[PDB]
Design a protein around this ligand. Structure first.
Ligand code: HEC
Length: 99
């Protein structure tokens, strides 16, 4: 629930994601909470991501951020994961502020 702490955790995402609407290694993450999974038009998602379905609910997001390949097997997102629930919670709060 701490957006300020979440901002710091986002430092682990900035190498591939932006919050300014621009897509790069990964799709822009501004407005990602509750967003259709694989919903950014034009971004070249992996087949597993496109087949996942549903939305990026806070729960779906926290699980994915703990272990990306366990939630979306075969994803092209090469991030090891955030093992601490507090870090995931704070990051999600930060993302929610950037909706
Ligand atoms: C590059 C080395 C990455 C790092 C570090 C992080 N992410 Fe990522 N992410 C990356 C790619 C290439 C992709 C597409 C994956 C695919 O299989 O197509 C993604 C995707 C996401 C998504 C899905 C977004 C959607 O529009 O469906 C999310 C929610 C996401 N990434 C979140 C995220 C966060 C919060 C990170 C820091 C903890 C993070 N990613 C790091 C590449 C990379």
């Amino acid at each position: 629930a701490d957006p300020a702490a979440g901002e710091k955790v986002f430092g682990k995402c900035k190498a591939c994601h932006k919050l300014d609407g621009n897509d790069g290694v990964g799709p822009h993450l501004n407005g990602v909470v509750g967003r259709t999974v694989a919903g950014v038009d034009g971004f070249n998602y992996s087949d597993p991501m496109k087949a996942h379905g549903g939305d990026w609910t806070p729960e779906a997001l926290q699980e994915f951020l703990t272990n990306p390949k366990a939630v979306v097997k075969g994803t092209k997102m090469a991030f090891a994961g955030l093992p601490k629930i507090e870090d995931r919670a704070n990051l999600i709060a930060y993302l929610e502020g950037q909706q």
